Amino acid sequence: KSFDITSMTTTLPFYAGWDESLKKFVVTNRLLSRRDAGLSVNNNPQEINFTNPPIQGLNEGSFLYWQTEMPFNSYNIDQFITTNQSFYAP
Amino acid sequence: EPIQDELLKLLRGGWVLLSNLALFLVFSSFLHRSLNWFVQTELLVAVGAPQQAGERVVGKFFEAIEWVERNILGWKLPGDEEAEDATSKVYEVLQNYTPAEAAYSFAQLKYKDLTHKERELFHKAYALRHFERRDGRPGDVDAAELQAVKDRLDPLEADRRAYAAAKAAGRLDEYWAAPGREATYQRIVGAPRIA
Amino acid sequence: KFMAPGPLGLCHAVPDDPSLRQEMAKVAHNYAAIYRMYNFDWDPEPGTVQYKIDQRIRRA
Amino acid sequence: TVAAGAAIVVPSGKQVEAASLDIYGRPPSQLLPNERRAAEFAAGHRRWKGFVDNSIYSWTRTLPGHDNP
Amino acid sequence: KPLQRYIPQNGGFTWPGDYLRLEIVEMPKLKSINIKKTSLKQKINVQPV
Amino acid sequence: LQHWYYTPFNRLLMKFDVDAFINRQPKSHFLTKNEERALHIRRFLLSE
Amino acid sequence: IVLSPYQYEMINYQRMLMRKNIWYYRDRMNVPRGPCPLHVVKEAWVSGIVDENTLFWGHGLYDWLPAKNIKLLLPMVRTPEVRFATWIKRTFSLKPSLNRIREQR
Amino acid sequence: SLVTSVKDYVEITHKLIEIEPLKNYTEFGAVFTYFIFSIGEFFKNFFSFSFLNNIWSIPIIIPDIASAMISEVSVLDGYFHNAFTFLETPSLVIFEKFVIGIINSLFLILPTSTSHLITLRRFVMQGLEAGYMAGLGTLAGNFLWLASIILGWRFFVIPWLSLDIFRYLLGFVLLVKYIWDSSKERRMALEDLSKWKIFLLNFLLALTEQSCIYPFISNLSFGPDASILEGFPVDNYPQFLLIHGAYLLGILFGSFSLLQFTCWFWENPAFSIYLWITTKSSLKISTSSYYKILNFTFLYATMLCAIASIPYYGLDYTITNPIGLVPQDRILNQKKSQSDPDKLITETAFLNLNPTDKNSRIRDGVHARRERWKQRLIKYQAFDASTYDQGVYDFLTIEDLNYGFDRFWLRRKMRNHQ
Amino acid sequence: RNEGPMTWPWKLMCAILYMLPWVDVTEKTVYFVERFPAFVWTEYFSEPFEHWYNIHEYAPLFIFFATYLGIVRNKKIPHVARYHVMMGVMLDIVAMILIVTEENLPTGVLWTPWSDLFYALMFWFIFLLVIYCLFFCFLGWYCEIPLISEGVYLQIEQAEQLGQ
Amino acid sequence: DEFESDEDNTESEWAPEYVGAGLGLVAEDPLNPQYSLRHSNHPLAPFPGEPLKWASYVYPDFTTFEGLSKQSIPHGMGVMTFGTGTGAGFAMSQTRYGDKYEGEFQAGYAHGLGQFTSEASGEVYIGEFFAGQRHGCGMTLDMKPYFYLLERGVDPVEAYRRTAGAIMKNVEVRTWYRG
Amino acid sequence: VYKGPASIPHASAEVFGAFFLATNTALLAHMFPGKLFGSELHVRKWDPDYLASCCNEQGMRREALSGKKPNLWLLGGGPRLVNDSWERMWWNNLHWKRWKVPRTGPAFPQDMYWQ
Numbered sequence A: 001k002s003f004d005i006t007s008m009t010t011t012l013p014f015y016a017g018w019d020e021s022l023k024k025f026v027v028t029n030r031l032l033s034r035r036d037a038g039l040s041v042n043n044n045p046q047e048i049n050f051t052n053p054p055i056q057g058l059n060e061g062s063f064l065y066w067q068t069e070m071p072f073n074s075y076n077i078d079q080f081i082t083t084n085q086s087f088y089a090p
Numbered sequence B: 001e002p003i004q005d006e007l008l009k010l011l012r013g014g015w016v017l018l019s020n021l022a023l024f025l026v027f028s029s030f031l032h033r034s035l036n037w038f039v040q041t042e043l044l045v046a047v048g049a050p051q052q053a054g055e056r057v058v059g060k061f062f063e064a065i066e067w068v069e070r071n072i073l074g075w076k077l078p079g080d081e082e083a084e085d086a087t088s089k090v091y092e093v094l095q096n097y098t099p100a101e102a103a104y105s106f107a108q109l110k111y112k113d114l115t116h117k118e119r120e121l122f123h124k125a126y127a128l129r130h131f132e133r134r135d136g137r138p139g140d141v142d143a144a145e146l147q148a149v150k151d152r153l154d155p156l157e158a159d160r161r162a163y164a165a166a167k168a169a170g171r172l173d174e175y176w177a178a179p180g181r182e183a184t185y186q187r188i189v190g191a192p193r194i195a
Numbered sequence C: 001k002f003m004a005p006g007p008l009g010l011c012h013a014v015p016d017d018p019s020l021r022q023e024m025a026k027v028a029h030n031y032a033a034i035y036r037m038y039n040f041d042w043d044p045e046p047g048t049v050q051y052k053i054d055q056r057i058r059r060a
Numbered sequence D: 001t002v003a004a005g006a007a008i009v010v011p012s013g014k015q016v017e018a019a020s021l022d023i024y025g026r027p028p029s030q031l032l033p034n035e036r037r038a039a040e041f042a043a044g045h046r047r048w049k050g051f052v053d054n055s056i057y058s059w060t061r062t063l064p065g066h067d068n069p
Numbered sequence E: 001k002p003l004q005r006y007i008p009q010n011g012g013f014t015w016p017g018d019y020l021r022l023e024i025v026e027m028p029k030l031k032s033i034n035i036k037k038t039s040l041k042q043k044i045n046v047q048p049v
Numbered sequence F: 001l002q003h004w005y006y007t008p009f010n011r012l013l014m015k016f017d018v019d020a021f022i023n024r025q026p027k028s029h030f031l032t033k034n035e036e037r038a039l040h041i042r043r044f045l046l047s048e
Numbered sequence G: 001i002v003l004s005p006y007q008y009e010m011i012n013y014q015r016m017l018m019r020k021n022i023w024y025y026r027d028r029m030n031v032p033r034g035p036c037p038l039h040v041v042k043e044a045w046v047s048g049i050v051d052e053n054t055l056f057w058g059h060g061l062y063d064w065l066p067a068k069n070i071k072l073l074l075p076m077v078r079t080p081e082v083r084f085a086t087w088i089k090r091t092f093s094l095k096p097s098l099n100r101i102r103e104q105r
Numbered sequence H: 001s002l003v004t005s006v007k008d009y010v011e012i013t014h015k016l017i018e019i020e021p022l023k024n025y026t027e028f029g030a031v032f033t034y035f036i037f038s039i040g041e042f043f044k045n046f047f048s049f050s051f052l053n054n055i056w057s058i059p060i061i062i063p064d065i066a067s068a069m070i071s072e073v074s075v076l077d078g079y080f081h082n083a084f085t086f087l088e089t090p091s092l093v094i095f096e097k098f099v100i101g102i103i104n105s106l107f108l109i110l111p112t113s114t115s116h117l118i119t120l121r122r123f124v125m126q127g128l129e130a131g132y133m134a135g136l137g138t139l140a141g142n143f144l145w146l147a148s149i150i151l152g153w154r155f156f157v158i159p160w161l162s163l164d165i166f167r168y169l170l171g172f173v174l175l176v177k178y179i180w181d182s183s184k185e186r187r188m189a190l191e192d193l194s195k196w197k198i199f200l201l202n203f204l205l206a207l208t209e210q211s212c213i214y215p216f217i218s219n220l221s222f223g224p225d226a227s228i229l230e231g232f233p234v235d236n237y238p239q240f241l242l243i244h245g246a247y248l249l250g251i252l253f254g255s256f257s258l259l260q261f262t263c264w265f266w267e268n269p270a271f272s273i274y275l276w277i278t279t280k281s282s283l284k285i286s287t288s289s290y291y292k293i294l295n296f297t298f299l300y301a302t303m304l305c306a307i308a309s310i311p312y313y314g315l316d317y318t319i320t321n322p323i324g325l326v327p328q329d330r331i332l333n334q335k336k337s338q339s340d341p342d343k344l345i346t347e348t349a350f351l352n353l354n355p356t357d358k359n360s361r362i363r364d365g366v367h368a369r370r371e372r373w374k375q376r377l378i379k380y381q382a383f384d385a386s387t388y389d390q391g392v393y394d395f396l397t398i399e400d401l402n403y404g405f406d407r408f409w410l411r412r413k414m415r416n417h418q
Numbered sequence I: 001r002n003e004g005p006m007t008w009p010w011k012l013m014c015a016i017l018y019m020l021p022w023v024d025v026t027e028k029t030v031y032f033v034e035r036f037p038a039f040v041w042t043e044y045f046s047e048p049f050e051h052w053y054n055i056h057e058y059a060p061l062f063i064f065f066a067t068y069l070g071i072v073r074n075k076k077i078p079h080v081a082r083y084h085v086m087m088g089v090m091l092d093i094v095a096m097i098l099i100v101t102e103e104n105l106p107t108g109v110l111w112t113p114w115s116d117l118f119y120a121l122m123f124w125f126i127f128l129l130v131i132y133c134l135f136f137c138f139l140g141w142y143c144e145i146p147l148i149s150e151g152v153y154l155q156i157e158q159a160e161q162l163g164q
Numbered sequence J: 001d002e003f004e005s006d007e008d009n010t011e012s013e014w015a016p017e018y019v020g021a022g023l024g025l026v027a028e029d030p031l032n033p034q035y036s037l038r039h040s041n042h043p044l045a046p047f048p049g050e051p052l053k054w055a056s057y058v059y060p061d062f063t064t065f066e067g068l069s070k071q072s073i074p075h076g077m078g079v080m081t082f083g084t085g086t087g088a089g090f091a092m093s094q095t096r097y098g099d100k101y102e103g104e105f106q107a108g109y110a111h112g113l114g115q116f117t118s119e120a121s122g123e124v125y126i127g128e129f130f131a132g133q134r135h136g137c138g139m140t141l142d143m144k145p146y147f148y149l150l151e152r153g154v155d156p157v158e159a160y161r162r163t164a165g166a167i168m169k170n171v172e173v174r175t176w177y178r179g
Numbered sequence K: 001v002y003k004g005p006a007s008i009p010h011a012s013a014e015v016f017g018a019f020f021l022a023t024n025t026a027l028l029a030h031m032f033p034g035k036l037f038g039s040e041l042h043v044r045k046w047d048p049d050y051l052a053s054c055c056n057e058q059g060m061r062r063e064a065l066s067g068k069k070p071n072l073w074l075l076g077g078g079p080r081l082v083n084d085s086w087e088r089m090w091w092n093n094l095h096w097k098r099w100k101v102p103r104t105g106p107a108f109p110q111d112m113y114w115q
């Protein structure tokens, strides 16, 4: 008997496009890496790095804008409300 | 009976229907917007102060008069300086009233290796920008020192991007002739690079 | 059209890449494992797992 | 009103070069489409403020100070 | 109370990555020199930092 | 009134519509209470 | 089958819970396919793209199940027009094509 | 759109903070300046053809393995990996596609839609030539749309499909004008311009979205497809051209043959059924009141075809989508002036309301309606009218809002004597 | 006798007077909107109209007397505007007849879902009549309702000579 | 009076039960242990009001969640990809852009069984999680030489043939207490 | 007996009768799918996304067989040339694709429940 009880399958959807090395029209399941999807685009030989699509920091105005939309929140802003600060340090 | 006459008559009928429906919707929108003011005036009558409601109505007329005086003619209308100081914008509150400890840059929590200078560079780039600080001009952050700090932390991603850049051009053996690339190939993969 | 899960997929040709057919066999194996948990035989054959289970139920 | 306002608002090429060269570091026709419109708007807003200051506000400030509430 | 849902939203009056930063906040603005003091229309209710 | 709300004379039209709807399924899909109990028992013994 | 009033009210309650459902199914590559309201499910059933053994998910379930084992899905799908058109498509389009593709390869 | 122009204006005013700050967002000089500039550029682009010089298409380039999802690539017992890649690839097939085209054309002309009803009304109330031109109009419009899909003419198909609300309004205007013309029972003989009118009506109705009565039968096709609009596998360019041309010619030949059969049926066999109804039936009806109820039945059927899509869509999709909004847009929930919890835009405040949202009719001083169904839940909007997958339930349960005796018992103040 | 067309202020006044029967049936909207959510905007549109038509108990009787004595009999006003005013009054009377009918239902029917169907049909029928008449009022045309519009024509030609 | 002359104290008011993973409970019905979950917020508790929903979320930091949700909270099964910030109860220094967790979620935390994968460092962990914090038995692999050689244009079969033995010799199997 | 000046159009009572009966019948036909002589009432023949996907399929296949690199045509529009976010660059096609579920419809319940 095998170690696996269920089979591990790749679970990626397919799409059509040009291959540039085979030089052919191809159906494939090769998508762009998640390490750089959303950060950059290449619509020319030159590359555009986008300036604000992931937020990389937060102040009180932008925290008030995105208060119920974040996956986390830190102590750094929540010091200044006493019930929240008691939740962090009981 | 010609096609042109039928299209023009259809166009005129559609225009008159749409214009009258838009006028009805504009009146209904005004009637939805202004209900609270009429309700407060009616409550001021019904509480037992019938003379103060006329003051509210003529105050609305006098507010229209004051708007005409201030905006078209341009007169001072004294007391406006005390009204201007009562309110402020969000970025002005950030410039004047907030501590620097109420802003962070996601990388002072992620990297423990950061010095104080890289910490304030990340703070000025991502936490409080040049419009959110008092003595802040555009171009405060260099974005070349920031790239150097972002390459010092996680250097292998920078190596991967350098490889992709050299492969897009024709400088691949110029990539491999850098003084550390063969050594890090030897360290990661336990055999020397045959190719 | 070979990817369609109904009768329309069965009458169409799978390409001759061996790794793709390996993947299709694995997906079908997982689907059969899901199917066996909800669909049962009325009269199970002696020597099978369901026959053993039914014998224990009757004994209980 | 639309054409009469557009005579006041719409700037010429020298205002657009002037509004581009101080807001941005670059001369025009070297910009993204969204950042050309900022220079055009700044030139038009400067024209509007200048017109209001020299042609409407030069003679309406005779100080009839009254009519408070 | 009806509890609030933590779903990210789309649209708005801004392009993504920005917030409304000319929004009016009831909070005063102090000039550098005060003389013949009277009062403030909008007060600073929480004074310590 | 909760008991009177569900009397058959008050639910008659519903009894027509469901009788159409449930008859669109294959006949072998109808099960006895003993059969559904037995199938539940077989499911968790197969898990063991 | 003679149903009790208890069974009638249970079917009606389940129909109330399932009125607004949007369905999804998996294909032979374990890839989920598009948003399926009930009429899209009927079109896919008539065309032969799905059948009663296809894995489905909707509200009320934790995991993906074959369509025959999901309660009330098949009575919702199997309209008389759907049954007639499914029989027409199976008899005169897909089975001759299956015999042709068995003989040709 | 309008929302995109507002976003661009807000971006400009945020840029102007470092140079010349504004008083507020709605300062009159800046708003007037931007309005003049934007309407000037809109008219400049409208005198041009903005659907002609813009970019609608992109090339698709597949990433190599070094740039792909590296953690998803696994090697299975050596020599295999799961990064899949495959190509899409006598005169009997030409004849086969011709015959399949004839059968699928037979599937096209089943009388289940709006245009077939208009053609039948022109065959009955008016002469043979009127019905012939109506049928020719549906044939030509269906052929143009089908050939555009088969041959892959995206320059027409995709910009035309992008204007969806305009297509819906065009269908409404055409049907309402036809209903008003048909309600006046006008009767000339037949002239060339009046011949071209009815052809143009059925041709233009073929390009819109219309109602159907037997959609699963009508969308059946011979062959392994979900519709009659899917292509065939071919090996090179002339095989593509010949195979799809043969299929299109089969569609055309079958459609013209069915039109000739319809004309032949409406010349002589129709009068046999007509005299069987009007003389051999035991019912006693005149010939001037049978036509009256026939005209009313045709009017009722085409009015139902014009009305049916109105409960189908909400006002979000038909109104706020052309404005430029997305579903559950952030400006539908934006409140004005922090300390005030009321919505900034009251014109769309009805969209996406929870049952636990407060009702505004309970404010003091308001002489609103009496709502006896809500008297025991008076602080909330105590009904559930939710859509696709947007239902939210917090201490007002699903059963209390819309099930059985719980819902019935909560609304008992409707049925007090007074 | 004025035979001219309607102009826009008469259209606006007639639209408000057509909002009156919607105000009189707007309680029963929930029994229709529950089944067809696309019409949920009809739950919220008429709220300030409900407020202003109930400022006093004697307000709608005053409105009916004022419109009948000052618009319908006045021959200088164009005939189609008087037609639309009398149509609004007749639709109001039809809605009040429906209210009288729903307040005399027996107690056995009132505790069944048949009452829910009756409420939904009340709202939907008045809403359909109002939408149809508002469409033809914004066009500026005559619209003929069966069993209603002939009485409207007779009442106009009766109110006219209501002097000699 | 039952409604106005009685108030609940803070320490004696009713709350839903905490059951954790849900194992080891006493079954009221021996044939149906799930019936014992009915007083809790466990993801398999029967009839929790609103249905469990298929959520696809993109957060402003570009963390994404895909999977089952309860009242918009990730609470069943699914996949979380990490953006510039963090998620699933992980600490901020653990994740990088493009890392992945797959497995069980309760109340927004990684809780139960799962797999953590990082493309940037090559670390793989398979095993148990308690409140996002790596608790119980686990297996750790370093897949960095294979990933490194794949990023420099080596086809995967040749890369696996070069790196598989050194990857297999360095597998670690351990017990973790709290991270 | 006086109706009007006859230069202002009069709509007949048959128009309202057809409108009234057609609205009520459309509502009843939407509530009961499967009972319209065994059928139901649809408001379109083909999904626009389905039609566009077929047209893109044939277009790129014809482009590939002619020896060129194929192009995908996007519903809503192509990209904007910006540099601040990916979502702003691809806003028009994203706006088309976000409206998928209400474009498919319907906005009323798909199955009948008896209250």
Ligand SMILES: CCCCCCCCCCCCCCCCCC(=O)OC[C@H](CO[C@@H]1O[C@H](CO)[C@H](O)[C@H](O)[C@H]1O)OC(=O)CCCCCCCCCCCCCCCCC
Pocket (backbone or CB within 6 Å): E013, E020, E022, E023, E024, H001, H002, H005, H006, H009, H010, H024, H025, H026, H027, H031, H034, H035, H038, H039, H042, H344
């Ligand atoms: C494609 C071309 C089409 C024409 C282009 C028309 C676009 C016109 C641009 C107008 C810009 C209006 C300013 C928007 C300010 C929003 C700023 C914001 O943060 O909101 C925030 C502000 C509220 O914010 C507060 O407002 C206070 C005012 O009391 C303060 O003064 C400050 O503004 C602010 O603190 O919201 C608004 O004021 C509500 C506006 C919502 C509606 C947007 C304008 C829509 C009007 C367009 C109608 C014109 C249609 C013409 C069509 C012609 C083509 C056929």
Ligand SMILES: CCCCCCCCCCCCCCCCCC(=O)OC[C@H](CO[C@@H]1O[C@H](CO)[C@H](O)[C@H](O)[C@H]1O)OC(=O)CCCCCCCCCCCCCCCCC
Pocket (backbone or CB within 6 Å): B025, B026, B028, B029, B032, H002, H003, H006, H319, H320, H323, H345, H346, H347, H348, H349, H350, H353, H359, H360, H361, I041, I042, I044, I045, I046, I047
């Ligand atoms: C860029 C800025 C974004 C702005 C987006 C603007 C959306 C514009 C929608 C405009 C349509 C609304 C009309 C204004 C309603 C006036 C009354 C109002 O404010 O009510 C305001 C009410 C909302 O009511 C509010 O509700 C709140 C609930 O939270 C509270 O109860 C408040 O007290 C109450 O005021 O809204 C309506 O009832 C909306 C009804 C709109 C439907 C009218 C049917 C007619 C539809 C148009 C017909 C088109 C015909 C085809 C034409 C062809 C051309 C396409």
